[PDB]
Design a protein around this motif. Structure first.
Motif, mmCIF file in Angstrom:
data_model
loop_
_atom_site.group_PDB
_atom_site.id
_atom_site.type_symbol
_atom_site.label_atom_id
_atom_site.label_comp_id
_atom_site.label_asym_id
_atom_site.label_seq_id
_atom_site.Cartn_x
_atom_site.Cartn_y
_atom_site.Cartn_z
ATOM 1 N N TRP A 99 0.858 -1.180 0.000
ATOM 2 C CA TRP A 99 0.000 0.000 0.000
ATOM 3 C C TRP A 99 0.894 1.230 0.000
ATOM 4 O O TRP A 99 1.937 1.241 0.687
ATOM 5 C CB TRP A 99 -0.898 0.021 1.259
ATOM 6 N N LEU A 100 0.499 2.237 -0.791
ATOM 7 C CA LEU A 100 1.203 3.511 -0.834
ATOM 8 C C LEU A 100 0.239 4.631 -0.479
ATOM 9 O O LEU A 100 -0.930 4.621 -0.913
ATOM 10 C CB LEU A 100 1.815 3.766 -2.224
ATOM 11 N N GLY A 101 0.758 5.615 0.281
ATOM 12 C CA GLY A 101 -0.052 6.754 0.701
ATOM 13 C C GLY A 101 -0.394 7.728 -0.418
ATOM 14 O O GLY A 101 0.078 7.641 -1.561
ATOM 15 N N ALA A 102 -1.277 8.676 -0.081
ATOM 16 C CA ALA A 102 -1.706 9.675 -1.059
ATOM 17 C C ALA A 102 -0.510 10.414 -1.649
ATOM 18 O O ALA A 102 0.482 10.678 -0.958
ATOM 19 C CB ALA A 102 -2.657 10.696 -0.420
ATOM 20 N N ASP A 103 -0.608 10.732 -2.944
ATOM 21 C CA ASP A 103 0.399 11.541 -3.635
ATOM 22 C C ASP A 103 1.784 10.898 -3.546
ATOM 23 O O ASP A 103 2.791 11.586 -3.365
ATOM 24 C CB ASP A 103 0.462 12.966 -3.074
ATOM 25 N N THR A 104 1.832 9.571 -3.648
ATOM 26 C CA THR A 104 3.087 8.865 -3.384
ATOM 27 C C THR A 104 4.130 9.231 -4.438
ATOM 28 O O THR A 104 3.799 9.413 -5.624
ATOM 29 C CB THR A 104 2.862 7.349 -3.389
ATOM 30 N N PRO A 105 5.401 9.368 -4.051
ATOM 31 C CA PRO A 105 6.433 9.528 -5.073
ATOM 32 C C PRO A 105 6.897 8.214 -5.674
ATOM 33 O O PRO A 105 7.632 8.244 -6.672
ATOM 34 C CB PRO A 105 7.569 10.218 -4.315
ATOM 35 N N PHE A 106 6.464 7.076 -5.143
ATOM 36 C CA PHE A 106 7.011 5.785 -5.545
ATOM 37 C C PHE A 106 6.288 5.160 -6.739
ATOM 38 O O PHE A 106 5.081 5.320 -6.923
ATOM 39 C CB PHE A 106 6.971 4.812 -4.365
ATOM 40 N N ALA A 107 7.054 4.418 -7.538
ATOM 41 C CA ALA A 107 6.537 3.614 -8.643
ATOM 42 C C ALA A 107 6.710 2.128 -8.334
ATOM 43 O O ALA A 107 7.782 1.682 -7.908
ATOM 44 C CB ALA A 107 7.246 3.953 -9.956
ATOM 45 N N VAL A 108 5.680 1.367 -8.584
ATOM 46 C CA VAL A 108 5.718 -0.044 -8.266
ATOM 47 C C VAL A 108 6.396 -0.773 -9.429
ATOM 48 O O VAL A 108 6.191 -0.426 -10.599
ATOM 49 C CB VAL A 108 4.277 -0.529 -8.004
ATOM 50 N N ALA A 109 7.230 -1.769 -9.116
ATOM 51 C CA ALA A 109 7.887 -2.553 -10.162
ATOM 52 C C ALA A 109 6.917 -3.572 -10.753
ATOM 53 O O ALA A 109 6.046 -4.107 -10.056
ATOM 54 C CB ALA A 109 9.106 -3.293 -9.588
ATOM 55 N N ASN A 110 7.077 -3.865 -12.033
ATOM 56 C CA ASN A 110 6.262 -4.931 -12.596
ATOM 57 C C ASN A 110 6.896 -6.290 -12.306
ATOM 58 O O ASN A 110 8.114 -6.410 -12.112
ATOM 59 C CB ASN A 110 6.054 -4.729 -14.100
ATOM 60 N N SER A 111 6.037 -7.307 -12.222
ATOM 61 C CA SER A 111 6.493 -8.656 -11.936
ATOM 62 C C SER A 111 7.448 -9.120 -13.031
ATOM 63 O O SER A 111 7.030 -9.211 -14.197
ATOM 64 C CB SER A 111 5.302 -9.590 -11.829
ATOM 65 N N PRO A 112 8.722 -9.392 -12.731
ATOM 66 C CA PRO A 112 9.673 -9.793 -13.781
ATOM 67 C C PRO A 112 9.537 -11.282 -14.129
ATOM 68 O O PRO A 112 8.791 -12.016 -13.478
ATOM 69 C CB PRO A 112 11.021 -9.537 -13.113
ATOM 70 N N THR A 113 10.366 -11.737 -15.098
ATOM 71 C CA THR A 113 10.274 -13.098 -15.635
ATOM 72 C C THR A 113 10.156 -14.120 -14.514
ATOM 73 O O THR A 113 9.287 -14.995 -14.527
ATOM 74 C CB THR A 113 11.514 -13.440 -16.508
ATOM 75 N N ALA A 114 11.017 -13.992 -13.522
ATOM 76 C CA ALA A 114 11.191 -14.962 -12.456
ATOM 77 C C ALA A 114 10.190 -14.797 -11.307
ATOM 78 O O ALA A 114 10.289 -15.538 -10.323
ATOM 79 C CB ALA A 114 12.637 -14.864 -11.929
ATOM 80 N N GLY A 115 9.216 -13.853 -11.406
ATOM 81 C CA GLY A 115 8.328 -13.560 -10.255
ATOM 82 C C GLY A 115 9.146 -12.969 -9.107
ATOM 83 O O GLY A 115 10.310 -12.618 -9.262
ATOM 84 N N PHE A 116 8.486 -12.759 -7.978
ATOM 85 C CA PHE A 116 9.145 -12.161 -6.827
ATOM 86 C C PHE A 116 9.366 -13.211 -5.756
ATOM 87 O O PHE A 116 8.704 -14.254 -5.727
ATOM 88 C CB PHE A 116 8.291 -11.031 -6.213
ATOM 89 N N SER A 117 10.243 -12.872 -4.809
ATOM 90 C CA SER A 117 10.526 -13.743 -3.676
ATOM 91 C C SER A 117 10.857 -12.872 -2.458
ATOM 92 O O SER A 117 10.949 -11.645 -2.547
ATOM 93 C CB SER A 117 11.699 -14.679 -4.004
ATOM 94 N N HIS A 118 11.088 -13.528 -1.328
ATOM 95 C CA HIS A 118 11.610 -12.825 -0.138
ATOM 96 C C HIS A 118 12.858 -12.000 -0.422
ATOM 97 O O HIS A 118 13.081 -10.970 0.235
ATOM 98 C CB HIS A 118 11.930 -13.837 0.935
ATOM 99 N N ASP A 119 13.671 -12.406 -1.396
ATOM 100 C CA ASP A 119 14.871 -11.636 -1.701
ATOM 101 C C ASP A 119 14.577 -10.187 -2.106
ATOM 102 O O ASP A 119 15.483 -9.356 -2.071
ATOM 103 C CB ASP A 119 15.665 -12.271 -2.838
ATOM 104 N N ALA A 120 13.356 -9.863 -2.550
ATOM 105 C CA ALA A 120 13.064 -8.481 -2.908
ATOM 106 C C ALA A 120 12.854 -7.543 -1.701
ATOM 107 O O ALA A 120 12.776 -6.325 -1.889
ATOM 108 C CB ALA A 120 11.806 -8.450 -3.810
ATOM 109 N N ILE A 121 12.732 -8.053 -0.482
ATOM 110 C CA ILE A 121 12.388 -7.172 0.637
ATOM 111 C C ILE A 121 13.524 -6.178 0.925
ATOM 112 O O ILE A 121 13.289 -4.972 1.085
ATOM 113 C CB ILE A 121 12.045 -8.008 1.879
#
Ligand code: ZN
Ligand code: ZN
Lengths: 335, 335
Positions: free
Chosen positions: A287-309
């Motif tokens: 979840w991101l707050g109002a007027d967030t400066p952040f951009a969410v990454a798209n799910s890459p080839t390999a999907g995501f894991s705990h290593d992304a934290i």
């Protein structure tokens, strides 16, 4: 002097003195598995609050994410490590700088509240007052004021949300990370995990010997505990949404999944070499707050894991270091 | 019951209501290795206080004892488990009833003070107030009043002995177990581990890059840290000797040993199937109070190991359970 360093070069690109303070809640979940979340296609409405926020575009769902192991002892330290799942040696994780150490060195005000067990060493180098036991009530030696809402006297995850304003007010004009370590979906006694308001999928199994109950009634209690986690996440977001002078984020990942009778297997903890996919498949939300400066990454080839934290947390606090070069994150770095 | 039980049949054969209360201090040491103790033949007086007590027959030395692993993360939970080294699974040790759970259920008053890291899960089912962080000072959120005797502001093991009378006075006419988890000989910065009184073997290595220092100067700082542990053990015994109303015992074992440059290997943490002997060889001592009813047990042919701890603790509290049959212990059961 006695730490294997990974991010000695780390520096904040921008600070709370030159832009809005950052305020992040990182929820370390427990035993929740990806394919019992309605937002991943489960045929029951287990996360009605999160589904509504996904439809509004406020919550981002990362789909079927992979945990590094099947137990908290293995996954929790690795979740906050620089090593990643492939090189992680649960035995000697504590000799290494972890991402909490880096953030604390750069001046982020860190609080870890725990209604589960403890931080599995992650908090050990920070002052003890920055870690708070929330699996005990105050007279038992802990802090949780919501332990007597149920006949088991079990402390509830929402007790960790009580007066987080204390921490925020103690750390004005500082970046803040709050880690909340859930009791969540721990079993086998899932029916103890949620107050009666969430006793909605019925009937439930009321025994700790899962094999004895009927499989559907075990699943019913598990999905009720998900409903309580959905509410806990909603109350966490509602608190963050009131912090309008900060740029806010809530990141949620479970520590591993759970077997629910597939080929007769229940619970978790199986050696990762032959653990079934259900024990390694976890939900992940941002979840991101109002007027967030952040951009969410798209799910890459390999999907995501705990290593992304670890790279995600560094990106949310604008930390530049070579330690995260080419590493997957849930949020892109700002420039 | 969400716990895998091992001693559900446990019962005390006698209680503090019909004989003298039992008072046991279990010292969980850190990185001390057997063959640098003067009582195992080391050519330097590293344990002068314990050596005098051994000469008097008050301390029993168990010689070269084997730890179950080469790190605290592995060894500490196994030291208190019923499974023993050969069935132990570090990831899932927390799912099992451990010996502290058994003693607590039977009414032994348990206190765990920790100047190391934490109890590695062993205390998690007991009320939080029975665990005390002693690696932080009070203003840091811990309890240790002896952290400002050295320029590193490092909390000292003797700070755990301050006013243990408080715990004894609060548990009149109860059996008591006090666990003290040492900082001990942790490296690589051995020279930080002891106050100036113990800077006796000179010169010392004052860097963390042990392969850079001359090897003997590394060894000199390691042996100085042993002197400080010898002093801590003497002060522990002196306190127990004054509890004349109880039958007392002090059991001491390290969590693992340490490599000190043999074939170029330093520190510990090597996988136990491949680790050199130095990392698995630990000291073990037992002190018994005046007029003790206990007797030292027959030595296993291969020598003792961490597996003896759980049966020893049960025997010292007169606990009868099938879980101790066939198992090695440092003292015999009373019958
Ligand atoms: Zn877990
Ligand atoms: Zn150790």
């Amino acid at each position: 002097t006695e730490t294997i360093m990974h991010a000695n070069d780390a520096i904040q690109k921008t600070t709370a003195s030159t832009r809005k303070p950052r305020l992040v809640v990182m929820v370390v979940g427990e035993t929740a598995r990806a394919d019992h979340a309605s937002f991943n296609g489960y045929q029951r409405a287990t996360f009605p609050h999160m589904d509504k926020l996904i439809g509004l575009g406020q919550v981002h769902n990362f789909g079927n994410v992979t945990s590094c192991g099947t137990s908290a002892a293995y996954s929790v330290p690795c979740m906050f490590s620089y090593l990643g799942a492939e090189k992680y040696d649960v035995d000697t994780a504590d000799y290494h700088e972890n991402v909490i150490d880096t953030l604390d060195r750069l001046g982020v005000a860190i609080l870890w509240r725990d209604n589960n067990s403890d931080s599995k060493g992650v908090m050990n180098r920070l002052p003890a007052k920055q870690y708070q036991d929330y699996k005990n009530s105050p007279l038992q030696g802990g802090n949780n004021t919501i332990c007597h809402t149920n006949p088991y006297d079990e402390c509830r995850d929402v007790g960790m949300l009580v007066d987080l304003d204390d921490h925020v007010k103690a750390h004005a004009n500082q970046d803040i990370l709050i880690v909340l370590h859930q009791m969540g979906n721990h079993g086998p006694a899932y029916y103890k995990r949620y107050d009666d308001e969430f006793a909605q999928f019925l009937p439930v199994c009321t025994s700790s010997e899962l094999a004895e109950c009927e499989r559907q009634t075990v699943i019913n209690a598990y999905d009720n505990a998900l409903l309580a986690t959905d509410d806990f996440l909603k109350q966490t977001i509602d608190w963050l949404a009131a912090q309008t002078h900060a740029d806010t984020a809530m990141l949620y990942l479970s520590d591993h999944g759970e077997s629910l009778g597939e080929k007769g297997v229940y619970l978790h903890g199986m050696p990762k070499a032959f653990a079934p996919k259900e024990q390694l498949s976890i939900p992940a939300l941002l979840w991101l707050g109002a007027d967030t400066p952040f951009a969410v990454a798209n799910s890459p080839t390999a999907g995501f894991s705990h290593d992304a934290i670890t790279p995600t947390l560094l990106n949310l606090f604008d930390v530049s270091t070579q330690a995260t070069a080419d590493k997957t994150a849930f949020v892109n770095p700002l420039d």
